[PDB]
Design a protein around this ligand. Structure first.
Ligand code: NAD
Ligand code: NAD
Ligand code: NAD
Ligand code: NAD
Ligand code: ADN
Ligand code: K
Ligand code: K
Ligand code: K
Ligand code: K
Lengths: 460, 460, 460, 460
């Protein structure tokens, strides 16, 4: 077996030890493996996967394989691979093209190695994506391959936005499931995973005390809520920026001061518009938005000396790293930790006081400087991914006639009953005990004893 | 002016001082007062109101009056009235029938004084309700009055369930707005209001240290989330019960142990099914469900000696108080605090060790033993109520032809843009500054610079 | 029985109900009652007591009486009495001169009624004091009575400072025990009691949401630590001022921003020295210092409109209330809540926006606007008070010859073994289980299996 | 230069980058460097140092060198060295014998390389020690070298106990400073350092979600307080064991359940004495005691399957690792992470469910699996170490006559004024501003405007 590319195949035994521990932390996902093993619901499935090649993704891959799938795998970020996970999957005879510290060229080459087998399009029929890079490449460069693909299961908020844009423009060629918007994904992974992994990544990259220090979190969606808690629980003094007044109201009620980097919130492109007093007091800035240039050049110029800058949103463009690359000298501390010298770019003084510390070159910090979300949280996301793969593979959209395709070409979420069954396995993994409604109580609140327990309008 | 009934009209000046303070804590609601004063959008409105007669409800009433409405008011709970608020509203010439410590008979007589003026149905044309008692009485006993009513605005989760039941059975006679499911209501009032007011009510009723003690919260919806935080932030060791595995998963991730009062979560009706060891360690139980008999007789028999029992869901039936009234002696400590002697009901021993403390006789504890939610939280709920009253009054359903009525007979929520505008006034009240998107950024995430910023599917 | 003065003797049954509940919350103090009942160690003791006449003080009084003492009692603050507690003690035939809302003249008259019986010095032989007012009056006005007094047991940090000043000046006439510096007092009452009771008092006085709002706590000793936590756990954004850099370092490490009301911390008596930007953002200021004028006139002029001002240190002088009384109009909201109108003092405009809210006229806010510390916390302080009364009464200093007096004239703390026995009863009251050292382990760390477990230098 | 032994000298540039960052996080220590550089107070000092060879210890070493000292250095733990810190110090021409993952034999050889230069006792005259191993070796094996040594500065609680034992037995040969009991050490490092570094080490070793899981912390001294907070802030359900009822009372008031591993707290030596139900629910145990066998064989047999076991007290003996090595198979996951298979010791099944995870082989987990405490915390400890080295070196005990020695042979702490000056530089490093007392205020509380601000009896 040679159909792979990883950093070091000799890490496979370490990877396999970690996979065995992870299996014990992922009861929803291992429950699906155990339930659906007999039935082989993914027999015949040929899955192109593009998602962070971590130990958790390993347990997802081997679940899909155990249910009958074949896969070809790549990471959706240049720094998110755990090399021992990539090695364990390669050593199991699974095609994977992933290492930590890819270049942009190696990243694209790795996605192309999943799409192509022996130099020709693989007989793919399913797509599992995180952030939409693989989905975009298939639509733009391999439209013939999409004729035989039954669906896309999309992990993250940014990738779902890209799918919905394609659906509105009539360019989406196969149906998708929005896995992000299961409650056991969005209100589990996006929030609690960032609570666990943001402070973890800053401590591994810098070993900085956080207690006592001033943080600014840009955004207060699911990731900004979990990020703000990651920092506040360590004793940081956390300020929150938002454009959405409903998310800002939650931040105030959660005990955060809501501030804007710009005077009166107005970003009119000038240095004069920067709240220099506020940014001059900030020791850490974290972007959580999925948006573009929310930590801009003028903010970076105004930050306190030796402030840490990082991004936990899907793509680097949240921070104006291109400005920093043009203007300022980069001194590498160790991989995924750079001192950015604001003195200029004509080399640097090792003793200069005027620098920022950038983590993961502005790429997803939790995965770049630590290991991303823990197994027990990713259990929820990846149980949903498996149920979504089963649903779209069983629906066989590619085999429908043209007029039947038209009725099914949609971006859909999984039913609440499945979201509840995932949650129940998660709860039992903590040793939680869920109460069973009496018939009197089920009748009183108007639900089945078996659920679903809430209307689809319920926000949790 | 004599068209009122309150405890003590001489409390009116104290009530008016508190209303003036509350106005300064309710910028969304006082913003609507200022915006809509010129236009008099509620000129001709005749509103039957049934909601806790607090200082916050006072500011809501005088906002509706300032926009042109006439009202007739009662409380929706026997113990929720603040007698100084009732007095200040009566002293202003507004018809209100409310006092703290009504009997069930006085509670019904107070609703009937709103419905009847000078012994004849009032010419009502709008309904503002909290929990659905007024709505039920109009549908069952005054169907002719609903012919002239343009709509119902319903405050709370339990009242919305009752409206939806009426809509499914085709017994609902007028359209309604679900005010509960604005984000600036459900994920503000229901959660953060209970965070503020639950520990406040237990302290006023008992003056018990909570730190170090064991609590069981039954439910982890919006109210159980806020209630569990109210107790945990004071240092209680909080356990959470749930029937909904998604809410139970959130409890686990929020750092609570999830337990059932029943062995393996199965209530078989018998004493054998009670987890006696768990209930024997609990010092406080709080029901938050909107359901029936979630703290049942067998649980009450098993609780630790001198445990506190209370309910913060809409109706008393959450706790089996009827069992306690049939079997056990009630020793009143002071109003809304009773020792329930488990020795029997043939008088009591003042020195008996074997009792429970019941707050507010099992009625809403935050309103019964304290003052409910604070003005700055109720600002959001009541800004929504005013917007909902304007919308249904302007729509004039009662004046539509039969065939036009059929298209409008619905239970609806307010548009997200209004929810956003309420939240923005709340944020500015904290001194928060919301960032304005650049045109580049608005285009990047596919929203207007003005909002709405989220899809209607977004759960916050 | 007529040898008392209280607000309303008809509250005695309510007071007695609360005392019976408090006994169940005070196991250390009720354990002493049970242990020492046979021995009557305080037979012959005649105790002048001056400490807040709360339900908790009631349980202390009746413990001293049960161990054989007679007492004459007054409160050490004009607003700290709970009238039902004072009534229950009077109705038990115990001399008490206390009500909530005394004037300064009534406060002094009440202490004088304890000192004098039937117009002549009582045959006092022991003193229990909180803050040193009674101790000062005996030294200055009744030196003959001190000839027959065996000791003083002093509750609080401010009173201990006054005793040590008298000891250094050679004016202290009888030995004292510093009850404040038991760990089961200072690191229990001073810290955790203020955590419980500060947010309790602000919510009863104002019903203000605290979440989201800016607080400034002046001080970070035991009371400032508990106060800062009281506010931070509700979601306040808390800033801390300190003069002691070691306490300030703890505040930084506990996740607070450390600020000064004065530019660069320099209080040079000018308006120019005030950090107007900082004070203009503060919604609540709490003084915790035991010092003088730490919230001064220039700070009060600079505070944000409608800010709440309160003191939880022993005496009112922490806030410059005398400035406010000279310059500004006081509008009473309700007892112990005043709007202070910064427009001037020639009456007030009920609708003026430019006011501060002062709680308890600047007197101890927890006791003034709520009920002070909870029974289960005061258990520790008052178990120490009883052990200190036993120790100094048994030592019989008044009966020593002049030369034996000289060797015993000291301010001492209770032994660590007694502090540990109090703590153990407190722990068992939570249902805590303390591990017993093996002989091997006791030998390894160099302690007895029975304790004491720490050297006297240990800070906990 | 060859007078060193490290893992990899090529890590020196990475070490030096991290030392330059650490200097910016250690203002008290770099303030002393700047203040005392002119004076060279340690000119002629020859310091044997034995303390964890981290980046923080690097900044301490180069401060001592900058003040004029020569040093010979080793780590006080086999797994605590950061090999880049060791390399940077060796590359600077400083003798250091340290690497991560020493054997017990290499650990002793490294201490011996400090004591011996070119095969003969070095002309040492000062000792800096953490835990007392170096101190014991000098007293037992190199008594002649102690004739020329002026003093010992001891970092940690366990080492101070060993010094005091030597002083009581009259075997201590040179005076010592207890650096541990500065407030800016004991109530900074021991508590907040463990808050930072315990959850950091468990995450790096296991990547386990902690939220939702059950922890037992054995001990609630400074380390158990910080450890319990490390776990609780991540959402663990934390139970605390203690032998000291005062520390147990603080645990209860801090909102922890206090439990014993043994029924009624009595370890009878037998399996029957184990609370099997409690230990069967624990997912993580952390020892923090400085004591022996506080997580014993019977507890290890009773723990829940797949529980994590770790120690953050000075020495491995807290956990019965000798029992585990005799009975059970050790499967190495990666360095400092072992699965301990409770099936027996005759090899292991890679898929066995019945194991415990042991971190750092039961040695200090924060240093063994992460990087120990952060620079900004160790700033305080190591500013004290430098002040202590200056004081004992200037006192020149070895040069005193026999009779002068007898008056100085003591274990002392640093003066409070120095503890204050360290804390003030720490506070200014957070951007904190300490208020200056007015003369009025200084007189009122009886202190100098310059401090000290507290009596030596004050516990903070
Ligand atoms: N690193 C991880 O492990 C991880 C986990 C899940 C999601 N993600 C990614 O994180 C991003 C956020 O995901 P989410 O689920 O929180 O999305 P979301 O839509 O819930 O939250 C994004 C928030 O950013 C706010 N925002 C937008 N522009 C802003 C601006 N200029 N200033 C301030 N706030 C602004 C929005 O109003 C919104 O509330 C996405 O790119 C998503 O794919 C990463
Ligand atoms: N006191 C107040 O001020 C206040 C404020 C808002 C709402 N309410 C009332 O509180 C109640 C709850 O409102 P909500 O918004 O939280 O509703 P919700 O539907 O969000 O939450 C109720 C929760 O109870 C759970 N539950 C139902 N039966 C249960 C059982 N037997 N055991 C355990 N859990 C069970 C459900 O699964 C659900 O998650 C309603 O009656 C509502 O009208 C009171
Ligand atoms: N209300 C209550 O129930 C209660 C409880 C216990 C104690 N007390 C009283 O509270 C006060 C404080 O007691 P404590 O035990 O916390 O004393 P403490 O000595 O532990 O703390 C007082 C703190 O105030 C600081 N301080 C002094 N002047 C200051 C200034 N100008 N600005 C900022 N900080 C300043 C000191 O440095 C010190 O750390 C005393 O008067 C005590 O008697 C009241
Ligand atoms: N890992 C680190 O970075 C670090 C930092 C500082 C100190 N330390 C070490 O940690 C240890 C503890 O230091 P400390 O400052 O907390 O000491 P401490 O004396 O403050 O606390 C130890 C606690 O253990 C308790 N205890 C003793 N035997 C027990 C038993 N059988 N069960 C339960 N509790 C028991 C004691 O009552 C005491 O309160 C020492 O060995 C010290 O040298 C480690
Ligand atoms: N202070 C208050 N004033 C009026 N209504 C309140 C108050 N506190 C809570 N409520 C309302 O009580 C309703 C339940 O009957 C909740 O939906 C909440 O909106
Ligand atoms: K991970
Ligand atoms: K209220
Ligand atoms: K009290
Ligand atoms: K470190």
């Amino acid at each position: 077996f040679t159909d792979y590319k990883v950093a070091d195949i000799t890490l496979a035994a370490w990877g396999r030890r970690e996979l065995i521990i992870a299996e014990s932390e992922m009861p929803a996902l291992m429950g699906l493996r155990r339930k659906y093993a007999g039935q082989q619901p993914l027999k015949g499935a040929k899955i192109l996967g593009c998602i962070h090649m971590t130990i958790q993704t390993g347990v997802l891959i081997e679940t899909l394989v155990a249910l009958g799938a074949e896969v070809r795998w790549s990471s959706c970020n240049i720094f998110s691979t755990q090399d021992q996970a990539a090695a364990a999957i390669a050593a199991a005879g699974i095609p994977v093209f992933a290492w930590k510290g890819e270049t942009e060229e190696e990243y694209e080459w790795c996605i192309e190695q999943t799409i192509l087998k022996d130099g020709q399009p693989w007989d793919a029929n399913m797509v599992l994506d995180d952030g939409g890079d693989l989905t975009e490449i298939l639509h733009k460069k391999y439209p013939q391959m999409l004729e035989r693909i039954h669906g896309i299961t999309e992990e993250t908020t940014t990738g779902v936005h890209r799918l919905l844009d394609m659906l509105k423009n009539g360019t989406l060629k196969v149906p998708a499931i929005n896995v992000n918007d299961s409650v056991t994904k969005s209100k589990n992974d996006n929030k609690y995973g960032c609570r666990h992994s943001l402070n973890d990544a800053i401590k591994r990259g810098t070993d900085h005390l956080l207690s006592g220090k001033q943080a600014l979190v840009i955004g207060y969606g699911d990731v900004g809520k979990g990020s703000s808690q990651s920092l506040r629980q360590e004793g940081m003094i956390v300020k929150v920026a938002e454009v959405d007044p409903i998310c800002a109201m939650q931040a105030c009620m959660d005990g955060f001061e809501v501030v804007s980097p710009y005077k009166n919130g107005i970003n009119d492109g000038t240095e004069a518009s920067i709240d220099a007093a506020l940014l001059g007091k900030i020791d850490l800035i974290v972007t959580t938005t999925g948006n573009v240039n929310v930590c801009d050049a003028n903010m970076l110029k105004a930050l306190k000396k030796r402030a840490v800058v990082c991004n936990i949103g899907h793509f680097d463009n949240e921070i104006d790293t291109a400005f920093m690359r043009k203007n300022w000298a980069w001194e590498e501390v160790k991989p995924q930790v750079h001192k950015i010298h604001r003195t200029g770019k004509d080399g640097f003084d090792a003793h200069n006081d005027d620098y920022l510390i950038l983590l993961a070159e502005g790429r997803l910090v939790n995965l770049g400087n630590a290991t991303g979300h823990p197994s027990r949280i990713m259990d929820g996301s990846f149980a949903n991914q498996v149920l979504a793969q089963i649903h779209l593979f069983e629906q066989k959209y590619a085999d429908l006639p043209a007029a039947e395709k038209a009725k099914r070409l949609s971006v859909e979420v999984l039913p609440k009953k499945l979201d509840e069954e995932v949650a129940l396995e998660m709860v039992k993994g903590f040793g939680g005990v869920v109460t069973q409604l009496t018939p009197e109580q089920a009748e009183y609140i108007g639900v089945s004893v078996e659920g679903p327990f809430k209307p689809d309008t319920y926000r949790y």
